[PDB]
Amino acid sequence: SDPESLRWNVQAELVHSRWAMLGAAGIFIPEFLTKLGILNTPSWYTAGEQEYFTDTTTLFIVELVFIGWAEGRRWADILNPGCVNTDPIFPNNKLTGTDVGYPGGLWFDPLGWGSASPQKLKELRTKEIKNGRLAMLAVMGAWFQHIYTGTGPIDNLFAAHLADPHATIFAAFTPK
Amino acid sequence: DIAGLTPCKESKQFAKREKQALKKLQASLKLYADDSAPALAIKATMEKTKKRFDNYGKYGLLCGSDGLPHLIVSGDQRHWGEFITPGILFLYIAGWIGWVGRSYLIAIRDEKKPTQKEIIIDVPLASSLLFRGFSWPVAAYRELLNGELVDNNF
Amino acid sequence: LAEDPENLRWFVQAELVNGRWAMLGVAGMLLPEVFTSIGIINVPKWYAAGKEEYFASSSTLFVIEFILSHYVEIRRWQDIKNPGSVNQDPIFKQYSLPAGEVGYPGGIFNPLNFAPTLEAKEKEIANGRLMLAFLGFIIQHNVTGKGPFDNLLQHISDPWHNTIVQ
Amino acid sequence: MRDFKTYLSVAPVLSTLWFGSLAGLLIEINRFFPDALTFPFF
Amino acid sequence: LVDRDPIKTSFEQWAKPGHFSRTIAKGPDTTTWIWNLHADAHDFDSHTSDLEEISRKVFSAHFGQLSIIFLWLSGMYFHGARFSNYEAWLNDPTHIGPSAQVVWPIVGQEILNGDVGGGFRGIQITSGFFQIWRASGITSELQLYCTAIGALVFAGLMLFAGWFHYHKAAPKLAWFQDVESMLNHHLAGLLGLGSLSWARHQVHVSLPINQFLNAGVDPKEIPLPHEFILNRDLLAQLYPSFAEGATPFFTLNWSKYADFLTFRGGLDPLTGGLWLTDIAHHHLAIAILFLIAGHMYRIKDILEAHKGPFTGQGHKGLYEILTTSWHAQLSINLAMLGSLTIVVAQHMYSMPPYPYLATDYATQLSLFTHHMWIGGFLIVGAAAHAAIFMVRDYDPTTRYNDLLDRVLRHRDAIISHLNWVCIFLGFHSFGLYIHNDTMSALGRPQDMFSDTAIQLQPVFAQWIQNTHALAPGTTAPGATASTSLTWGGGDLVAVGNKVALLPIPLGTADFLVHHIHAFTIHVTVLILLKGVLFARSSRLIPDKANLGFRFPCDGPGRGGTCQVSAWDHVFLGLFWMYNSISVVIFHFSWKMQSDVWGTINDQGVVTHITAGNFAQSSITINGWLRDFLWAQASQVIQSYGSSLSAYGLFFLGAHFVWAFSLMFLFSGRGYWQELIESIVWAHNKLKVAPATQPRALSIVQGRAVGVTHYLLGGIATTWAFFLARIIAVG
Numbered sequence A: 001s002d003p004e005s006l007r008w009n010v011q012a013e014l015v016h017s018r019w020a021m022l023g024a025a026g027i028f029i030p031e032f033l034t035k036l037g038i039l040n041t042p043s044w045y046t047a048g049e050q051e052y053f054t055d056t057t058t059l060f061i062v063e064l065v066f067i068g069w070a071e072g073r074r075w076a077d078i079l080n081p082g083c084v085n086t087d088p089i090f091p092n093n094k095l096t097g098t099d100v101g102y103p104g105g106l107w108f109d110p111l112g113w114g115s116a117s118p119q120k121l122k123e124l125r126t127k128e129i130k131n132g133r134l135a136m137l138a139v140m141g142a143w144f145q146h147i148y149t150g151t152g153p154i155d156n157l158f159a160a161h162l163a164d165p166h167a168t169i170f171a172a173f174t175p176k
Numbered sequence B: 001d002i003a004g005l006t007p008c009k010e011s012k013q014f015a016k017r018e019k020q021a022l023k024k025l026q027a028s029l030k031l032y033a034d035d036s037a038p039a040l041a042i043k044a045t046m047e048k049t050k051k052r053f054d055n056y057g058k059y060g061l062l063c064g065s066d067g068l069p070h071l072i073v074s075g076d077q078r079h080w081g082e083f084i085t086p087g088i089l090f091l092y093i094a095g096w097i098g099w100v101g102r103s104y105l106i107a108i109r110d111e112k113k114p115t116q117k118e119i120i121i122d123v124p125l126a127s128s129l130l131f132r133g134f135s136w137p138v139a140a141y142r143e144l145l146n147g148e149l150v151d152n153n154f
Numbered sequence C: 001l002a003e004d005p006e007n008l009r010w011f012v013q014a015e016l017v018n019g020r021w022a023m024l025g026v027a028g029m030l031l032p033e034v035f036t037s038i039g040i041i042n043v044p045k046w047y048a049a050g051k052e053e054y055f056a057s058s059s060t061l062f063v064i065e066f067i068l069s070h071y072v073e074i075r076r077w078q079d080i081k082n083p084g085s086v087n088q089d090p091i092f093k094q095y096s097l098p099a100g101e102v103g104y105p106g107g108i109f110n111p112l113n114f115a116p117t118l119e120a121k122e123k124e125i126a127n128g129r130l131m132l133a134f135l136g137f138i139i140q141h142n143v144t145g146k147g148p149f150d151n152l153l154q155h156i157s158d159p160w161h162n163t164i165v166q
Numbered sequence D: 001m002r003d004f005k006t007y008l009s010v011a012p013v014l015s016t017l018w019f020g021s022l023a024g025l026l027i028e029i030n031r032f033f034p035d036a037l038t039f040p041f042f
Numbered sequence E: 001l002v003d004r005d006p007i008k009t010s011f012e013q014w015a016k017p018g019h020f021s022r023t024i025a026k027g028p029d030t031t032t033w034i035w036n037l038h039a040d041a042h043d044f045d046s047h048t049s050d051l052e053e054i055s056r057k058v059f060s061a062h063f064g065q066l067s068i069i070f071l072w073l074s075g076m077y078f079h080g081a082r083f084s085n086y087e088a089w090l091n092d093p094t095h096i097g098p099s100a101q102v103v104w105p106i107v108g109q110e111i112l113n114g115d116v117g118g119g120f121r122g123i124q125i126t127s128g129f130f131q132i133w134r135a136s137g138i139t140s141e142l143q144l145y146c147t148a149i150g151a152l153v154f155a156g157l158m159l160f161a162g163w164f165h166y167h168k169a170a171p172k173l174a175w176f177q178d179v180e181s182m183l184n185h186h187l188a189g190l191l192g193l194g195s196l197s198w199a200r201h202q203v204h205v206s207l208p209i210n211q212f213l214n215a216g217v218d219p220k221e222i223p224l225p226h227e228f229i230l231n232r233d234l235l236a237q238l239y240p241s242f243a244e245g246a247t248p249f250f251t252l253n254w255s256k257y258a259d260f261l262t263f264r265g266g267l268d269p270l271t272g273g274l275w276l277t278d279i280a281h282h283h284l285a286i287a288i289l290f291l292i293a294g295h296m297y298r299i300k301d302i303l304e305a306h307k308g309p310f311t312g313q314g315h316k317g318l319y320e321i322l323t324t325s326w327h328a329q330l331s332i333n334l335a336m337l338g339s340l341t342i343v344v345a346q347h348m349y350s351m352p353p354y355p356y357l358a359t360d361y362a363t364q365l366s367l368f369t370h371h372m373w374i375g376g377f378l379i380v381g382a383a384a385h386a387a388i389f390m391v392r393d394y395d396p397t398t399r400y401n402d403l404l405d406r407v408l409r410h411r412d413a414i415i416s417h418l419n420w421v422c423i424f425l426g427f428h429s430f431g432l433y434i435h436n437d438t439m440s441a442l443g444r445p446q447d448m449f450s451d452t453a454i455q456l457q458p459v460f461a462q463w464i465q466n467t468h469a470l471a472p473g474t475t476a477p478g479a480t481a482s483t484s485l486t487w488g489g490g491d492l493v494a495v496g497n498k499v500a501l502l503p504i505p506l507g508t509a510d511f512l513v514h515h516i517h518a519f520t521i522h523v524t525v526l527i528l529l530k531g532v533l534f535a536r537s538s539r540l541i542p543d544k545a546n547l548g549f550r551f552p553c554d555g556p557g558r559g560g561t562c563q564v565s566a567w568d569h570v571f572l573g574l575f576w577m578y579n580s581i582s583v584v585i586f587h588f589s590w591k592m593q594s595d596v597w598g599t600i601n602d603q604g605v606v607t608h609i610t611a612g613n614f615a616q617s618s619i620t621i622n623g624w625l626r627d628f629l630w631a632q633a634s635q636v637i638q639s640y641g642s643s644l645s646a647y648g649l650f651f652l653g654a655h656f657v658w659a660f661s662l663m664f665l666f667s668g669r670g671y672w673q674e675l676i677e678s679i680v681w682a683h684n685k686l687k688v689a690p691a692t693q694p695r696a697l698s699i700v701q702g703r704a705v706g707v708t709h710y711l712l713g714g715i716a717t718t719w720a721f722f723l724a725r726i727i728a729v730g
């Protein structure tokens, strides 16, 4: 007769969303951008074709020393000051709560009209395409599936096999 | 070295164990997998107990008669980490089981009606008092015996 | 009803002795790096004096010294229960008498004090750690290695090595 | 969404997602080192 | 309770201490209520004082069994499929020795995985799929992989009918509280329309696809996935397309036939699983009945009818409250369902119904003891729940002066007899054996009770066995052999790997086990009978229906005043039955191997797994560990380092778990209290205990952790003892 589940943090799920998905922008346009036959060709000789490898797992370290830094700073002062103890304001804390952060300390604040209001108008823009980005990337992340599964010849694994017409992979279109 | 015999560097009886016993693992002249891709005695199960050759590491490891290896651990000749190395380890791990036992417990008996909060779990595992254990340098080895759990509370 | 901390004397003094001996410990290394060539364990002995006698032994050396360290150390004990060390610059620091806005109890966070001319045991704060954790570092990387930094020919780039032990 | 001074609850036997698993990841150390009886160190 | 309603929350009850009797789980903390909650979780003296729902729950929380038996089976069909051995075993039976399960070689594991047949590593089976599965008028591994998901289909759906009850706003009274038709339906067309339906898919498809399997081939060199439609042309080999008959009746001519069936009895030479040419006819000849039968009726009438003098006036009116009970119409059922399971246990071993059983020894005795513990574990229950009636179910006493009010009238009486019955037995039913010892260890055989010393003479024969295998000469039509090959007269030639069934002779050492059974079956029942009868009132306690059918014990007075009750008569009644079945098992295999199971070769000189050692040597009750327990079991205590090994390696635990029960069975209670505090003390010093008042076991919970253990202990012990002396020689 209907679930018991608006996770109160029904309020927070929605912000790894704008994380996950704005983000899939980075893959969506640079991919098919690629640049078909640019003129053309992909060749990267430079730091890479003679100094004994370049990356892989010095890759990650440097690579996400920064993502390191930044992803942390991201949610852990999104906002929330007050930042300790001890009775309920719910999210699972707002034990920042009624105090934002400081009683007349510094400029904790951005912007006049005693709040943080990045003004009133802009529902426009990112309500639409952006929680789009959530939606969008559902189905061209449902293409990740289509785009490659079938492990282009070079391997049948656990041999059912189980019929046979013709191949599959990616580049755009479809026989049909 | 001590009461039993010497390690792996030589242990005749132990050798015979390697060989008959396991290798009769053999015992199945064939049993069909001439090329076939499943029945895996064949590869390892032996070789994983086996390529464990005249090497097992080398461990010292005393080995008595029948050559099954015995554990002295008296902190000498070679054998020290057959109790202490995996001993302090047992200690450290436990005690950070119950350091937090005496924790997602001493954090409740207060506020408003706290009479079985524990059949559900407030922070799962405690996931707050969690690391208090690795975040034990010294810790109970002082603060247990001085203050808090202080003889007073004794 | 003793809410929370506490402690104090305690192991703030606990630290600085780590800090300032991790600092010294690394004077240990300092040597073999500029006009370089000589160290690791090098299980010293340790700098060794004259050509008039020792001779592998002449004695447990090492063993003794720290019988001495020993009653000098009861001495710092011989301080911290009941404050006694003229300078007085560790137990809270010098600037004679003071800091002990934590000697009689009641801390919570208490930052501290102590140089007359002038500033503090502070940016001797963080040389304080740089070196403790450094050791952590230092006798971290032995257990496979023992030397730093040439140029851009073929050194600083990590070429091929060999697991942990396993 | 979870800050400082204890959090949200959990069921009767989440121990069955604690015996099974965690502990489960340990067979996962008992095949990486498919064997023990002393142990090398790091 | 709120939270708060009635009517005027959807907001569900997650949070606020308790529920279940009203100075409930109280604010104040405790542990006992955590075995409470699970125990008596299903019950009905609480939930509501008003029938209504309960039947609306049990028709749902039921459901989730079928669905489950349905998630189960699937992982068995799947399992009996891609974790193959079935494909390999079927082209190659008599030869293989089946598997479905296999480990994964983590830690010690692998020893458990030891070459089983069509060329692979695994752990064996004593659960006769691979043999229902003979059926497959089709064969194929991925196919069972459809029958498999076909299983998960029935489930999710036959599990959303359980949403589509209680949680959905439910039916009510009339629906079940008009019973008028129920069996009408059930038996008619399912009992009927299955057996019937099963007929149609038991000659259509199966018969033919093992009519020409009992020879050779390799499957798909036979039985396509559709092949068996309109094509009534291969049905040509296994009788006419009726030729000139039209819908049975008689203006029919047979100058040479009589449809499929052509009744058998005996055993296929090449697959002695009893003939299938019959198996259609018998299921057909069932259904009809059910098809005709489930057509009674609408109910009192028939029972409101035949009374007499001493008979049952209340026979007439034998329960309005049999539309208003459950605990009653469950207890009745369990006696039947239960007692109608272990009747399987025989007609199976003395008349196999699947291809390749008997030759398969271990893959149909496992059976005959699994089916055997249910036709027992469901019977003591079938008493428990009557005690649950006898105590409470109805509202008041509206039930009066009848068959029962009658039986109770005598009660220090029906059980007055039955008692002496048992000590007459026991003396004639066990010390009988003890004679032998005391006098064969004294040693003078002249005077034992041997199949040969006390007067009986080289024959048993003349009774009824010998007028069963010989009866195809009565009103009997016939059909070579009998009905069950194990009967006195004629025939031998049964099977070409090992053996199957043959006469099975008797006299003494068959005479007196058969009697220990009596005394065992009887004193079991004494304790349940007197237990459920004296359910509510007595002359040790009359104020004795005042809580429930459990209650620990009334109190130190009256002398004892402890066991009484009827939870506990259904606690010491299990304690026996564990024997009742546990010694019936002990019977069958020592027979079935001492004789029967054994083996042919030239001149078919029979060579039983044991040249009849039984003979003069079960009669001694030491011979029962000379010849049994110490003889066989040498395979359990040799079993290390092997493939089955998990049995010997259980056989120590569970031969431990039992020897842990006694601790729970044999002990006080304020004891582990008195102890639990010493503990609780040391606890408080470090500051580590009080919250949720730790407490000892609930007098009768303690008994609950006896018994249950004493059984899962004392039982699996043999579950191991067995599978370890039929796998490998036998």
Ligand code: CLA
Binding pocket: B097, B098, B099, B100, B101, B102, B103, B104, B105, B121, B123, B124, B125, B126, E678, E679, E680, E682, E683, E686, E688
């Ligand atoms: C958090 C835990 C906790 C702690 C610190 C202790 C500590 C102690 N127990 Mg103990 N105990 C516990 C839980 C605990 N127990 C539980 C749950 C039981 C089951 C009823 C017992 C049953 C028990 C008995 C019978 C005895 C002790 C005794 C003792 C003392 C001797 C230590 C010993 O050898 O037993 C080893 C510890 C056990 C056998 C306990 C097993 C349970 C552990 C694994 C709890 C683990 C944490 C648990 C999952 C909590 C959830 C975490 C939460 C923060 C989310 C010591 C003071 C002995 C004593 O009185 O002498 C001083 C006595 O023999 N205990």
Ligand code: CLA
Binding pocket: E012, E056, E057, E058, E060, E061, E063, E064, E068, E159, E160, E161, E162, E163, E166, E167
């Ligand atoms: C997704 C759905 C769902 C939800 C949210 C609920 C919620 C509820 N149901 Mg419910 N129910 C459901 C599906 C659901 N049901 C289904 C599918 C069925 C039929 C199969 C039922 C049959 C049912 C009945 C008869 C009753 C309820 C009741 C209730 C209420 C009490 C629930 C409770 O705490 O039981 C806790 C129990 C569980 C969460 C598990 C359910 C047990 C089954 C279905 C699966 C477990 C068996 C499993 C194999 C365990 C044994 C093996 C083990 C070794 C692992 C609550 C509002 C009760 C009520 O109205 O209040 C008195 C009432 O008794 N339900």
Ligand code: CLA
Binding pocket: E038, E039, E040, E041, E042, E043, E044, E330, E334, E377, E378, E379, E380, E381, E382, E384, E385, E388, E567, E570, E708, E712
């Ligand atoms: C068709 C029947 C069936 C049904 C539907 C019921 C239904 C019921 N019985 Mg019941 N019963 C049955 C057959 C049945 N019984 C049989 C055959 C017996 C004889 C053994 C009994 C003996 C019996 C008793 C003595 C009682 C009931 C009670 C009840 C009621 C309580 C149910 C409950 O809370 O779960 C109880 C189940 C548990 C608490 C789960 C514990 C199960 C443990 C013991 C595990 C079993 C061992 C197993 C090997 C362990 C799993 C593997 C492990 C090693 C990993 C309920 C109405 C009780 C009542 O008070 O009536 C209102 C009363 O206690 N029954």
Ligand code: CLA
Binding pocket: E649, E650, E651, E652, E653, E654, E655, E656, E657, E658, E659
């Ligand atoms: C705690 C006590 C102490 C101990 C250690 C034992 C131990 C034992 N007693 Mg014992 N006993 C005791 C006190 C004790 N008793 C007392 C005080 C009495 C009363 C006087 C008895 C009366 C008694 C009797 C009458 C019997 C025993 C027996 C036994 C033995 C069973 C064989 C065995 O376990 O092989 C050891 C090997 C294993 C346990 C291998 C286990 C591997 C399997 C189970 C899998 C691994 C475990 C896994 C968790 C299980 C799967 C469960 C899963 C679903 C979670 C065992 C050695 C029995 C016996 O065998 O001969 C006398 C006999 O029945 N005892």
Ligand SMILES: CC1=C(C/C=C(\C)CCC[C@H](C)CCC[C@@H](C)CCCC(C)C)C(=O)c2ccccc2C1=O
Binding pocket: D015, E663, E664, E665, E666, E667, E668, E669, E672, E695, E696, E697, E698, E699, E701, E702, E703
């Ligand atoms: C031994 C014995 C006890 C003592 C038995 C006890 C106390 C068993 C209860 C022990 C429980 C099951 C331990 C539960 C603790 C854990 C579930 C908590 C930690 C959670 C896990 C992660 C370990 C009785 O209470 C008793 C009562 C009546 C008749 C006979 C006996 C009897 O024989």
